[PDB]
Design a protein around this ligand. Structure first.
Ligand SMILES: NC(=O)C[C@H](N)C(=O)O
Ligand SMILES: NC(=O)C[C@H](N)C(=O)O
Ligand SMILES: NC(=O)C[C@H](N)C(=O)O
Ligand SMILES: NC(=O)C[C@H](N)C(=O)O
Lengths: 354, 355, 357, 353
C-alpha cells in the first residue's frame, strides 16, 4: 500500500454551472466514491477503511494505492491564485509530508504553469512526487478529460518515485518548472518547449530516468514561505516608451522578468537603456527571457539586453523565471552579487546551461 | 516580365560582424550581382538592362522576374523598429505603387510579426503582394537560411497575385497579421497558429486560394499614416497588483492589449477591476487577447474579462491586436462606441468571427 | 432519444489475460452496466427499460443516447480478421439498419484501418454514422484509453449525422478509408496522412462539415457481399527478384496493390517488367501505391510504374487501395477496362484527384 | 584544410529532363565550379589547386573544406539500386579511406534509407563521417532543396567527427540506419521515428550523447559478404498460407516479416505451419512492425514468436533487412549465433529494453 494526499484547490476539473458560467464546485470525495475507477468498494469494506480514504482498484503490477481527499475552501478559479495561495499548498504538503508517499494537486489550468514553477522552488530537497493536474472540461460533464487526467496523476504519484513537482495532462508528465500553456481549448493544453516530458503513458509507461532528478536522502525538506512578493513580468513591445518602463520599475518592485524579442534583444534607444540602468542603481534585479516559446536567450547582437543587474534567463520559461526570481530574492541576507549567481544556476531543473 | 521592388530595411539577413556582434550591413545589390541564383548575367547583357536592376534566372513556368534593390538608410536591427519605421515602409510602397507588380521587404526577425501586422493595416485596399522575409543567419555566412528565404519571397511576389501583406520563411507563406515568432534559433521561426499558411513551396507550389483575399480593383490604395502611437501591450501575471496596473494605464495611453490567462480570464479581485473601470471612464479602450499561442478568447468563467470598453480579441495574435488598435484609434472623428465596433470586425483577415 | 447499436467484435479493448497473454474477453454488457459513465441506472428504472439496453447519462446539449450491445461470437483479435468477417459486420448493420440511428463497432487495432476501409466500400449509400473504435489497453485494466474511446464513439454516433465509416481514437474522428496505423504503443495510434480529421473533440466539438459527405436520402443502402477475395498486397524492396514476383502473381490472384518507392517508382530491370506484363495478360489488375506515409503517386521518372493494367493509386492508403480493389473486382459483369476506370475514381472519399492549377 | 570525397551516384539532385521525364544527368563538377557557395575561385587560383578539386568558401573559425567530385557512371535513379550498388559505394570509400577525412554520397531519395542502412553495416569500425544526401528537386531547377542539402552535407562531413553513416536532409542529420521516407513530395521527406544526431539553425546542435565513439585501435573492415537472398514480406489481412509458402521457398535464407501493430499476425494454423516449415529448412525471420513509430513486443496470443523468429524491436524495416543481410553473410556461424547477433544493437539501429 502507498498513500497519497489529493489536494483539491479548484479549477475547471471540479466546476459547476451557475448563472450560465462555470464556478468552483464542492463535494469531490462524494462524487469519487460513486466511481469504480476511483474507488474500490469491495476492498474498502474488506479492510474496513476510514470513510475519508479512497482506494484505487488494483493496477497491473506494483502496490495498491490509497488516497485521502483534502478539499481546500474556498475553492478557486486559478486566475485568482497568487504566491500566497501556492505557499498555503506548500504548507499543506509540509505538515503532512511524513504521513504520505506522494501528492496530487487539482488545480485550474489558467495559472497551473506558474503554480507548478512556484511549488518547484518552495519545496527544496523534495523527495516525493507532487503532481499537478487539471482539466479543460469539468469531471461532472460526461465527455471530459478530467477522469483520465486525475487517475493518471494518482497512478503516477502512487507508483513511481519522481521527486519533482510535475504536471500531468493528456497522457504526459512534464517537469513543472518547464511547462507553459499553449492552447486555451484543446486537451493538449500544455507543452514543455525546451525539455522532454519526464514520462509518457500508452500501452506501457515510458519514463525518462536520465532526466528525473535524484532523491537527496541526506537533506531534509525545507519549505520556503519566504518568497519575494514584489516581482513582476514585463513584456516588451515595439516602441515601448522609456516613460512607461520607468513607471513600471518604480519602488517597491525588487525584481522583474523582461520578456524580450527573439534571442534576447530589445530596443537600444538610450532613454530606455537609461531607465534600466537607473533601476539597477536602485538595486532591482532583472532577468532576460525570450518572448519566444522555444529556444534560448543568447548574446550576439548589438541589441542584446545585458549589463548591470541583468541575468540571462537562457531557456527558462517565464513562469520559471518569475518563480526563481521570487525564490532567490526571498532568501535572507545575501549580497546582490550572490543573488545574481544563484539566478544563473540550475536550481530545480528549470534551466539548461551551455 | 514582372518587376518587383526589394526594400532592404535591415535585419540579420544582411548583417555583418563588428566588435564581435552582428550589426546591420550595407551593400546588398553589390553582393546579389555576384550570385547566379539572384542575378542572371547572360540575360542582363542580352537585354542591356539598367545597372540598378537585377534579373532572376528563368523558373519552371510563368514570366521572368526582374527587381530593383532599395536599400534604406540607416539600416536597422528590427528590435529598434517602431510604428514610425513601418509607416516609412508603407510610404515607400505608396510612392512606387504604380511602377512595380509586387514588393519584398527584408526585415529583422525580432519584430517581423509586428511589422507585418502593422503594414497589413496601413495598406488599405492593397492590390499587390508585399512579402516580408528575413533570416536567422546572415546571407554572407556560408551556411544560412537567407538565400532560400529571399529567393522564395521574390518568386512568390513575382509569380502570384496575393494582395496581402505576407511573411515568407522556410518554404511557407503566412498571412502577415496571423503570424507570431515561436522559435528564437530554428529556421522554422514563425508559426500561424489560428490559420493555415497561404502557400507552401515544394516540388510544386500549393496556394490556399479559398483563403487569399480578393483584389478590390475599384477601390484605390489608401495608406494610413494616422496610426495611434499611444497604445501598449500588458501581459498579466499572477498577483499583478492594482497599483501597477494603475500606473501602466495612466494618461496619455489611449489603448491597451491585455494578454490574459487561458480562454481570456484574469483576477477578479476588486481593486484591479476598479482600475480597469477607472481607465474605461477616462476613455481608454482595452482588447482582451489570450497569452496562449493557439485558440480563442471566449466567455464562460466568472473570471472572464468583459465589460465597459473591453473588446474580445477572439483568436487574434497580440501583434495583430496591437496594430488593429493603433489603426482604429488613429481614425479621425469617431465615437468610442464606434471604435469598439470596428475592433470587433475582421478588417484584414486577422480575426475569425464565431458562428 | 437516439438509439445506437454497439457491435463488439473483439480487440484489446475487451481482452483479458490468460497464460500471460491477452485474448478476447466476453461479457461486455455485464461490465458496462456497472459503470456510471456508461449506464444511468436512475434513468433506466425511471423508464423501466429493457435489460439488454443501456443509457448514457445526459450530455451538455442535444438528445439522450441509448444503446444495445451485440456481442459477436467468437470474439477475435483483429489480426485474425478477413474479408469474410467484415462482410458479417456489414450484414449485421444491414439487418438492423432501420431500428438504429447509428453504429459503433469495437474492433482490434491491428487491422482496424483495413476493416474501416472495407466497410466503407461494402456500405454503399450509407446514411448513418458507423464509428469504429478500439484501444491499446483493455477496458478492465485500470489505466486505459478504452473508456474514453468507447464513450467518444457512442457520443459521436449518437449526436451527429456523419454518414461515413469513421474511426474514433484519442479525441479525433477520422475518415475510415483515410486512416493508417502509425504507432504500435501510443494512444495516438492512428493518423490520417492525406486528409484532415473529420472531427476533433475538446472543450467543444469541431466538425469539418466541408469534408463530411452528403446524405443521399433518395438512394437505398446497398450492401456488397460480392467482394473479391483473391486480392493481395506486395511491398517492393530493393533488388526484389523477378522470380519472386512471378510466384506472388500466380493464379488465382485477380488483383494486387504494389507498394512502390517514393512518388510511385520501381526497378526498371526487364525481367521484372516482363512479369508484370505477363500478369496483365492473364487479366490481373495492379494498383500502384506509395510506400510513403504522406503524399501521392505521380508520373515524372523513367522508373514510374505505369502501363498495361496498372492504375495509379494517387494518395490512397494501401488499406483503401486493397479494399477498393476488392470492391471493384467483385462487381458483376464489367469489362476489365471499366474496372480500371472505377479504380481511378473517388468512390468513398478515399482518393484525391490531382489539381489542374 | 580537411578534404572530402563527394560521390555522385545519381538521384533527382542531379537529374535533367528528357522525353518529358527526369533521368540522371552528368556534369556535376562543371556546374558546381560556377557556383560561389560551392567553389571559391579566388582561393583556388591563390593556391593553384588541381582542377578536379573544389573549395568551399570560409567560415570564421574552423578549418577550410576542399572536396573532390567522383561521378559514378552510369548514374542511377535510386529505384534501380541493389545490394551490389551499395557494395560498390562501400568499396569506393574503402579504396580512398586514407586520403580523405569524410565522405558525402549524393543519392536518390526513393531508396536512400535502404542504402544508408546497408552502408551502416558494410562499413564496420567506421571512423569518419559518411553523409548521404539527395533532393526532391534537381539542382538545375531554380527553386530547389538541393543546394542547401548538398552544402549542409559537405559542411557537416567537413567540420565534425561523427563516425557514422548519416542522412542529411532539410537542416537535419539523421542516423542513417534509423531513417525512413515518410513523404513523397515535401522537402521534409525523411523522419527518424531516435532523435536526429544534429540540427542546423542559427547554431549547430549535435546530440553528442547519441553519436557513436571512434574506435581508433580497430581497422575499417568492409563487408562485401552481404547475403543477397533476403526478402521483405508485408502481411495483409487474410494473406493465405499458400502464398507465404511460395514466398519462403529456397533459395531464400532470411526474411523480414512486417507484422501488425506490436508485432502480431494471424494465428491460423496453416500459416503458422508454413513459418515452422521454413524454420526447419533453416530460414531466419525477423519480426518488424508495419507501424512507423514504436516497438515490437510480446503480449498477445497473436504475437509472432518462436523457432527462428527474432524480434526486430524498434528497427526500421530498412535496417532489419540490412542487418539480416549482414549477419547471414558472416562466415561459419551457427544459426543460433546468427540469431543472437540479430538481437544485438550492432550499429545503433536498435534500442534494447
Ligand atoms: N480549465 C481551467 O481550469 C480554467 C479555469 N478558469 C481555472 O483556471 O480555474
Ligand atoms: N534574425 C534577425 O533578423 C534578428 C535581428 N536581431 C533582427 O530582428 O533584426
Ligand atoms: N490494440 C489492439 O487491439 C491490438 C490487438 N492485437 C487487436 O488488434 O485485436
Ligand atoms: N528524389 C529522388 O531522388 C527520386 C528519384 N527517382 C531517385 O530516387 O533516384
Amino acid at each position: 500500500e502507498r498513500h497519497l494526499l489529493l489536494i483539491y484547490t479548484g479549477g475547471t476539473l471540479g466546476m459547476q454551472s451557475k448563472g450560465g458560467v462555470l464556478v468552483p464546485g464542492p463535494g469531490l470525495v462524494t462524487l469519487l466514491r460513486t466511481l469504480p475507477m476511483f474507488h474500490d468498494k469491495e476492498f474498502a469494506q474488506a479492510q474496513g477503511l476510514p470513510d475519508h480514504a479512497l482506494a484505487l482498484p488494483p493496477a497491473s503490477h506494483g502496490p495498491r494505492v490509497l488516497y485521502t481527499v483534502l478539499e481546500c475552501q474556498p475553492l478557486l478559479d486559478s486566475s485568482d491564485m497568487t504566491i500566497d495561495d501556492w505557499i498555503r499548498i506548500a504548507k499543506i504538503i509540509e505538515r503532512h509530508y511524513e504521513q504520505y508517499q506522494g501528492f496530487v494537486v487539482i488545480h485550474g489550468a489558467d495559472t497551473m504553469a506558474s503554480g507548478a514553477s512556484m511549488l518547484s522552488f518552495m519545496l527544496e530537497n523534495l523527495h516525493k512526487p507532487v503532481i499537478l493536474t487539471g482539466a479543460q472540461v469539468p469531471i461532472r460533464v460526461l465527455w471530459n478529460d478530467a477522469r483520465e487526467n486525475l487517475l493518471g496523476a494518482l497512478l503516477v504519484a502512487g507508483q513511481y518515485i519522481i521527486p519533482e513537482v510535475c504536471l500531468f495532462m493528456n497522457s504526459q508528465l512534464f517537469r513543472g518548472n518547464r511547462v507553459t500553456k499553449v492552447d486555451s481549448q484543446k486537451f493538449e493544453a500544455f507543452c514543455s518547449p525546451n525539455l522532454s516530458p519526464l514520462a509518457t503513458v500508452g500501452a506501457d509507461v515510458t519514463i525518462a530516468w536520465d532526466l528525473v532528478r535524484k532523491v537527496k536522502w541526506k537533506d531534509p525538506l525545507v519549505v520556503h514561505s519566504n518568497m519575494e512578493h514584489d516581482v513582476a513580468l514585463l513584456r516588451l513591445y515595439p516602441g515601448i516608451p522609456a516613460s512607461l518602463v520607468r513607471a513600471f520599475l518604480q519602488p517597491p518592485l525588487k525584481g522583474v522578468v523582461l520578456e524580450t524579442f527573439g534571442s534576447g534583444n530589445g530596443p537600444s534607444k538610450p532613454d530606455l537603456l537609461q531607465e534600466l540602468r537607473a533601476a539597477a542603481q536602485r538595486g532591482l534585479i532583472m532577468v532576460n527571457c525570450s518572448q519566444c516559446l522555444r529556444g534560448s536567450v543568447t548574446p550576439g547582437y548589438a541589441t542584446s539586453l545585458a549589463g548591470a543587474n541583468i541575468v540571462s534567463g537562457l531557456d527558462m520559461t517565464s513562469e520559471a523565471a518569475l518563480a526563481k526570481l521570487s525564490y532567490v530574492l526571498g532568501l535572507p541576507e545575501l549580497s546582490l552579487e550572490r543573488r545574481q549567481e544563484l539566478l544563473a544556476k540550475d536550481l530545480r531543473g528549470e534551466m539548461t546551461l551551455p
